[PDB]
């Protein structure tokens, strides 16, 4: 009975969340930063382990109802961990450790997204697939935002550039993950939302990278930021287009065409602002 | 040829065993405590990594004989790692690190249990599944006492509660894992053996939590211990109940209810005296 | 679309590689030996992480060329990390840290090989499997040399014995992995090539261990070295034989008989010279 298996999943989830919180609460009472990073590491490893366990267990589910429960559980684990890591990250003074917290957030997000994507591939109901797609989008945006806020506190362009790199992958993979699942929708309504979700991800990543990039002093890194931004846009456009290639009603695609145009105009404007501020 | 795959699995196991003890042996002559904790984590990683590798290798096996060896290998790894961690944990003076050691064992035990469950799910023969049931029970019991033994030498009570929770999950997860495997049996005698295993785990876990509670100083903790105990009891009973539902013969059922009756009252017995030890 | 999954794989591979080079670059300018080791741990985990992600994704591919891309990607990941680690290991003065470095190199190679082995099992065309066998063999040979070069820099015979062990495990598993993959060849031309790969691996591992053993002063470790060499030879010979039973043409078998003989003669020569060096 998967109900019992889903219960096994819940048990793992609640404990993981509980452990994460207490460890976080413990970290607030510690002084030396190396140990604070360890608290983040413990949170990161626990979340990664639990996600891996739940996924492997989730493959043994035939019921979408229970598969949605596993995905629902997995997403909250990621979000909870990301928040815990973020607030702990606010207490770091060394960019190296702040970079590691950023690294941890990205890797959790990638792990969670890919896990959800792999599970979501087995859904026949579009409603549940839309929820999985929604979860991925929310995870990507959350992780990207956390990284941005942390990035403002770096002094080294190299570390800010490293943050930019991490954001780009979160954007790319999330889009790709969404694309694979969105390709499997027969309902036109849900397909339009994926385009909307993708567009928002593109806008978020592009804006964040711009804002970090605007704080660079070295031309070499700003050029890397510019390179990164358009690649996100080009990826997003293909995703929207390919999904649009398989939809028949133009009403929704005209908005999809609008989405493509907005992504371009936002990206072109962002890059344009960056080049104008270069020497 | 699975013989070769089993040979790869065996090689992985022996190497893992070799590394774990050596690291443990090294740790006994080092002080610091940080390095001993590092050794424990390394041991945890070795066992977890090896178990994950072995499972993945074991999943491509069709012959049950080789799979039982794989299940046995996983069981042996845990016991060696657990025993090693326990003896090393006794060499720490800072209770926090012993609490961390408890975390490693619990997470380690869970990894092994689910792995065995996943392998055992592919068995058609009740005999080999029965070996897995005993193994899972033995892993939980070994880990639970190990956690129990460690809790007695520390000074901060809440970590006993942290230990108590960890104990609860081992009991909790083991029961469900046992339930899933027992569910695939057609012969009534073996189901009774599984119920007995469940009963032993429950009493084992419940007694431990009780023994920790008398060593607690503040009132809220025993209520949590009480909370922990009862959740274990109701489920185990429910698991036994649902398994008893699958028996047609009148003889065995009285023992299943006997198991239920013993689990309830003994649990009741443990808890109420705590109220006598409660303020 | 498998292209999209392969596209996701591409992002992960380049990024892991991106991070690996950067971590290596940072490590070379730092002074605390632990921080270099810390970077190595990061290199190991990231390399391990990407493989863990890629493998699960690659299993969802139907086109074999894309599977070969994944095998290639995994292979390139391992080599890059190993090379990076070696460069860092040369900067260690303490053998203790070097033993850990040896472990990391070994563990990465094992991870990649097993991943490829699991992936390679899904190829029906002998051509790509021959590439898969080749990739595994080259990874093994590369890892053996890196460890061998590092072993030359140790002062403690015990740590070299650990290095000898590390070489042995890689040789054995690669040989066994190749055997499993070679078992799936129908063309005798291709089966003979797998035998050749095994023979080269055997001679290489034996050669490394022999040269390391000559630098020992203690008989106890050299006796372990004879043991180490001999176990490898026995495994390789039987592996080649098992492959030979499924060959129908006597011509290729003579090469296998030759291959076995070359392995045997190499081992006795190696062992005998070691016996001449005992007191």
Short mmCIF file of N, CA and C in Angstrom, two decimals, chain A residues 77-140:
data_model
loop_
_atom_site.label_atom_id
_atom_site.label_comp_id
_atom_site.label_asym_id
_atom_site.label_seq_id
_atom_site.Cartn_x
_atom_site.Cartn_y
_atom_site.Cartn_z
N UNK A 77 10.96 20.81 1.53
CA UNK A 77 12.26 20.51 2.12
C UNK A 77 13.29 21.46 1.56
N UNK A 78 13.28 21.61 0.24
CA UNK A 78 14.23 22.49 -0.44
C UNK A 78 14.04 23.93 0.01
N UNK A 79 12.81 24.42 -0.03
CA UNK A 79 12.52 25.80 0.34
C UNK A 79 12.90 26.09 1.78
N UNK A 80 12.56 25.16 2.67
CA UNK A 80 12.86 25.32 4.09
C UNK A 80 14.37 25.38 4.30
N UNK A 81 15.09 24.48 3.65
CA UNK A 81 16.55 24.43 3.74
C UNK A 81 17.17 25.71 3.18
N UNK A 82 16.67 26.16 2.04
CA UNK A 82 17.18 27.36 1.39
C UNK A 82 17.05 28.56 2.33
N UNK A 83 15.87 28.71 2.94
CA UNK A 83 15.65 29.79 3.90
C UNK A 83 16.56 29.68 5.11
N UNK A 84 16.68 28.48 5.67
CA UNK A 84 17.53 28.26 6.83
C UNK A 84 18.96 28.64 6.50
N UNK A 85 19.44 28.18 5.35
CA UNK A 85 20.81 28.47 4.92
C UNK A 85 20.99 29.97 4.71
N UNK A 86 20.01 30.60 4.09
CA UNK A 86 20.06 32.03 3.79
C UNK A 86 20.21 32.91 5.03
N UNK A 87 19.35 32.71 6.02
CA UNK A 87 19.41 33.51 7.24
C UNK A 87 20.70 33.25 8.02
N UNK A 88 21.19 32.02 7.97
CA UNK A 88 22.48 31.70 8.57
C UNK A 88 23.58 32.40 7.77
N UNK A 89 23.40 32.43 6.45
CA UNK A 89 24.37 33.04 5.55
C UNK A 89 24.53 34.54 5.80
N UNK A 90 23.49 35.18 6.31
CA UNK A 90 23.55 36.61 6.62
C UNK A 90 24.58 36.93 7.70
N UNK A 91 25.00 35.90 8.43
CA UNK A 91 25.93 36.07 9.55
C UNK A 91 27.40 35.81 9.18
N UNK A 92 27.68 35.59 7.90
CA UNK A 92 29.05 35.36 7.45
C UNK A 92 29.74 36.66 7.07
N UNK A 93 31.03 36.74 7.37
CA UNK A 93 31.86 37.89 7.04
C UNK A 93 32.86 37.58 5.92
N UNK A 94 33.14 36.30 5.73
CA UNK A 94 34.09 35.85 4.71
C UNK A 94 33.37 35.46 3.43
N UNK A 95 33.73 36.10 2.32
CA UNK A 95 33.07 35.84 1.04
C UNK A 95 33.16 34.37 0.65
N UNK A 96 34.26 33.72 1.01
CA UNK A 96 34.44 32.31 0.71
C UNK A 96 33.32 31.48 1.31
N UNK A 97 32.98 31.75 2.57
CA UNK A 97 31.93 31.01 3.25
C UNK A 97 30.55 31.40 2.71
N UNK A 98 30.41 32.66 2.31
CA UNK A 98 29.17 33.13 1.72
C UNK A 98 28.99 32.50 0.34
N UNK A 99 30.10 32.31 -0.36
CA UNK A 99 30.10 31.63 -1.64
C UNK A 99 29.68 30.17 -1.48
N UNK A 100 30.14 29.54 -0.41
CA UNK A 100 29.77 28.15 -0.12
C UNK A 100 28.29 28.01 0.19
N UNK A 101 27.75 28.97 0.93
CA UNK A 101 26.32 28.96 1.24
C UNK A 101 25.54 29.08 -0.06
N UNK A 102 26.01 29.97 -0.94
CA UNK A 102 25.42 30.13 -2.26
C UNK A 102 25.54 28.83 -3.06
N UNK A 103 26.71 28.20 -2.99
CA UNK A 103 26.94 26.93 -3.66
C UNK A 103 25.94 25.88 -3.19
N UNK A 104 25.76 25.82 -1.88
CA UNK A 104 24.85 24.85 -1.26
C UNK A 104 23.42 25.04 -1.74
N UNK A 105 22.97 26.30 -1.78
CA UNK A 105 21.62 26.62 -2.22
C UNK A 105 21.39 26.15 -3.65
N UNK A 106 22.36 26.43 -4.52
CA UNK A 106 22.25 26.06 -5.92
C UNK A 106 22.18 24.55 -6.08
N UNK A 107 23.07 23.83 -5.41
CA UNK A 107 23.13 22.38 -5.53
C UNK A 107 21.86 21.72 -4.99
N UNK A 108 21.30 22.27 -3.92
CA UNK A 108 20.04 21.76 -3.39
C UNK A 108 18.94 21.96 -4.42
N UNK A 109 18.90 23.16 -5.00
CA UNK A 109 17.88 23.50 -5.99
C UNK A 109 17.99 22.60 -7.21
N UNK A 110 19.21 22.40 -7.70
CA UNK A 110 19.43 21.53 -8.85
C UNK A 110 18.99 20.11 -8.53
N UNK A 111 19.39 19.63 -7.36
CA UNK A 111 19.03 18.29 -6.92
C UNK A 111 17.52 18.13 -6.84
N UNK A 112 16.87 19.10 -6.20
CA UNK A 112 15.42 19.06 -6.01
C UNK A 112 14.68 19.15 -7.34
N UNK A 113 15.11 20.07 -8.20
CA UNK A 113 14.45 20.28 -9.48
C UNK A 113 14.52 19.02 -10.33
N UNK A 114 15.72 18.47 -10.44
CA UNK A 114 15.95 17.27 -11.24
C UNK A 114 15.16 16.10 -10.67
N UNK A 115 15.11 16.02 -9.34
CA UNK A 115 14.34 14.98 -8.67
C UNK A 115 12.85 15.10 -9.02
N UNK A 116 12.32 16.32 -8.92
CA UNK A 116 10.92 16.57 -9.24
C UNK A 116 10.64 16.29 -10.71
N UNK A 117 11.55 16.72 -11.57
CA UNK A 117 11.41 16.50 -13.00
C UNK A 117 11.33 15.01 -13.32
N UNK A 118 12.22 14.24 -12.71
CA UNK A 118 12.27 12.80 -12.94
C UNK A 118 10.99 12.11 -12.45
N UNK A 119 10.46 12.59 -11.33
CA UNK A 119 9.20 12.06 -10.81
C UNK A 119 8.03 12.51 -11.67
N UNK A 120 8.04 13.78 -12.06
CA UNK A 120 6.95 14.37 -12.81
C UNK A 120 6.78 13.74 -14.18
N UNK A 121 7.86 13.16 -14.71
CA UNK A 121 7.82 12.52 -16.02
C UNK A 121 6.83 11.35 -16.06
N UNK A 122 6.47 10.85 -14.88
CA UNK A 122 5.59 9.69 -14.76
C UNK A 122 4.13 10.06 -14.50
N UNK A 123 3.80 11.34 -14.63
CA UNK A 123 2.42 11.80 -14.42
C UNK A 123 1.62 11.83 -15.71
N UNK A 124 0.39 11.33 -15.63
CA UNK A 124 -0.54 11.34 -16.76
C UNK A 124 -1.52 12.50 -16.64
N UNK A 125 -1.79 12.93 -15.41
CA UNK A 125 -2.70 14.05 -15.18
C UNK A 125 -1.94 15.36 -15.31
N UNK A 126 -2.46 16.24 -16.16
CA UNK A 126 -1.80 17.51 -16.44
C UNK A 126 -1.83 18.45 -15.24
N UNK A 127 -2.88 18.33 -14.43
CA UNK A 127 -3.01 19.15 -13.23
C UNK A 127 -1.79 18.96 -12.34
N UNK A 128 -1.45 17.70 -12.09
CA UNK A 128 -0.33 17.37 -11.22
C UNK A 128 0.99 17.78 -11.86
N UNK A 129 1.07 17.68 -13.18
CA UNK A 129 2.27 18.10 -13.90
C UNK A 129 2.44 19.62 -13.82
N UNK A 130 1.33 20.34 -13.85
CA UNK A 130 1.36 21.79 -13.71
C UNK A 130 1.86 22.19 -12.32
N UNK A 131 1.47 21.41 -11.32
CA UNK A 131 1.93 21.63 -9.96
C UNK A 131 3.43 21.35 -9.83
N UNK A 132 3.90 20.30 -10.49
CA UNK A 132 5.31 19.96 -10.47
C UNK A 132 6.12 21.03 -11.18
N UNK A 133 5.60 21.49 -12.32
CA UNK A 133 6.22 22.58 -13.07
C UNK A 133 6.24 23.83 -12.21
N UNK A 134 5.12 24.11 -11.56
CA UNK A 134 5.00 25.26 -10.68
C UNK A 134 6.01 25.18 -9.54
N UNK A 135 6.15 23.99 -8.96
CA UNK A 135 7.08 23.78 -7.86
C UNK A 135 8.50 24.10 -8.30
N UNK A 136 8.89 23.60 -9.47
CA UNK A 136 10.23 23.84 -10.01
C UNK A 136 10.48 25.33 -10.21
N UNK A 137 9.50 26.02 -10.78
CA UNK A 137 9.63 27.45 -11.04
C UNK A 137 9.81 28.20 -9.73
N UNK A 138 9.01 27.84 -8.73
CA UNK A 138 9.06 28.49 -7.43
C UNK A 138 10.40 28.23 -6.74
N UNK A 139 10.90 27.00 -6.87
CA UNK A 139 12.19 26.64 -6.30
C UNK A 139 13.32 27.43 -6.94
N UNK A 140 13.29 27.51 -8.27
CA UNK A 140 14.32 28.23 -9.01
C UNK A 140 14.35 29.70 -8.61
#
